[PDB]
Amino acid sequence: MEKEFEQIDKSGSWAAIYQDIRHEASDFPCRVAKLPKNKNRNRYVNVSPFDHSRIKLHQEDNDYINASLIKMEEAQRSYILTQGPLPNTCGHFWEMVWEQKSRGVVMLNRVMEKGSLKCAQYWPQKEEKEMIFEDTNLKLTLISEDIKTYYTVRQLELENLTTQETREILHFHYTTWPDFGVPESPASFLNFLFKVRESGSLSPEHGPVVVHCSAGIGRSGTFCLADTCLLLMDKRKDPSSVDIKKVLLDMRKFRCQLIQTADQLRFSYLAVIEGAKFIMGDSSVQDQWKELSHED
Ligand SMILES: O=C(O)C(=O)Nc1sc2c(c1C(=O)O)CCSC2
């Protein structure tokens, strides 16, 4: 990837490669997304889940959410990628987290960005003010939170009000990754990815992690592409056998248009190439990312 990276950079060809990926990517129907009744369930008219990998809500009324299951078979990790919840679909989002048995929610965007409300405020910002989502009968409380300078970790309690079963959900909120943008550095992104990893939420005893940005494609695609490249590499301890563009194409079978610009593609190569130092047995790089990232 690293010889590949410098051949791309050297000849200024990131947009054409990105363009090429774009022409190779799958396209499957998104007919349920586009039903008239689901119009207000999609944030963006042109970003829909394919029918074959969409998450169905376990409810008879209307089972649709804008969300897909990215099942990475070789890597043996799955993720749910979803749009930032809308004001009428926060109760569906939480219904999805409960039914799917997810332990973690990775949020890569802010509620407000570039002057616009890119996502609903779907979680409580304070402990005394729980949310009840009456359409899906679910209660959520802020148990606490750890605010760093570029991310915050929250612990949430999700109650299914129908059984009174309770689960803890960890929320990993990256607050300084710009829409259509890249993280400040490979260090700080890697520091963030490894916080999520260490917490256990990626672990196969749990449902798939839920990753969202505002559309569930650009920042989320970038997050997942890095994670999975690094997992692949880990399982074989063989960096040279991971084909990043080929992993992004496999992920694009399950949701359209994963990774939104050519600099996000380029950052993913940066992230995986740096992350490999750690996968290949230099644990010291991890606490270096931590220093560089200025987390406190
Ligand atoms: O949130 C991201 O990282 C991302 O993919 N966002 C996307 S992808 C996308 C859009 C947006 C957006 O937020 O405006 C606007 C419609 S075109 C494709």
Backbone angles phi, psi at 158, to 5 degrees: -105, 120
Which sign does the torsion angle of CA 74, 76, 77, 81 carry?
A: positive
- Is the Cβ atom of 217 under 6 angstroms away from ligand 1? yes
- Is the Cβ atom of 213 under 6 angstroms away from ligand 1? yes
Per the CB < 8 A criterion, the answer to whether 157 and 166 are in contact is yes
Pairwise CA distance, residues 75 & 78, whole Å: 9
Per the CB < 8 A criterion, the answer to whether 260 and 180 are in contact is yes
Q: Which residues pair with 117 in a beta bridge?
A: 112
Give kind and range of the element (H or E) at residue 282: none
Pairwise CA distance, residues 252 & 26, whole Å: 6
CATH node for 1-296: 3.90.190.10
Pairwise CA distance, residues 157 & 167, whole Å: 6
The residue whose CB lies within 8 Å of the most ligand 1 atoms, and thus the one to mutate among 213, 219, 263, is 213
What SS3 class is residue 92? helix
The residue whose CB lies within 8 Å of the most ligand 1 atoms, and thus the one to mutate among 179, 189, 224, is 179
> How was this structure obtained?
X-ray
Give nearest CA residue, ligand 1 atom 9.
Answer: 215
What's the CA-to-centroid distance between 26 and ligand 1, angstroms?
A: 19
Structure-token match 């760093």, residue found: 148
Please identify which of the residues 90, 213, 224, 256 carries the catalytic annotation: 213
Q: Is 132 annotated as a binding residue?
A: no
- Reported structure resolution in angstroms: 2.1
What SS3 class is residue 143? strand
- Taking the mean position of all CA atoms in its chain, how far away is CA 122? 16
- Is the Cβ atom of 183 under 6 angstroms away from ligand 1? no
The residue whose CB lies within 8 Å of the most ligand 1 atoms, and thus the one to mutate among 22, 42, 44, 268, is 44
Specify burial of residue 293 (Cβ count, 10 A radius: 0-12, 13-18, 19+): buried
Q: How far is CA 186 from CA 122, 128, 181, 230, 244, in A?
A: 29, 37, 13, 13, 16
Pairwise CA distance, residues 41 & 84, whole Å: 11
Distinct helix (H) and strand (E) counts, the chain: 8, 11
Backbone angles phi, psi at 57, to 5 degrees: -65, 140
Per the CB < 8 A criterion, the answer to whether 206 and 167 are in contact is no
Give nearest CA residue, ligand 1 atom 8.
Answer: 215
Pairwise CA distance, residues 267 & 286, whole Å: 18
What's the CA-to-centroid distance between 258 and ligand 1, angstroms?
A: 10
Pairwise CA distance, residues 225 & 258, whole Å: 9
Token code pair at residue 82: 């979803």
Quick one: which of 99, 30, 29 has its CA closest to 66? Answer: 30
90 is catalytic: no
- Domain locations in the chain? 1-296
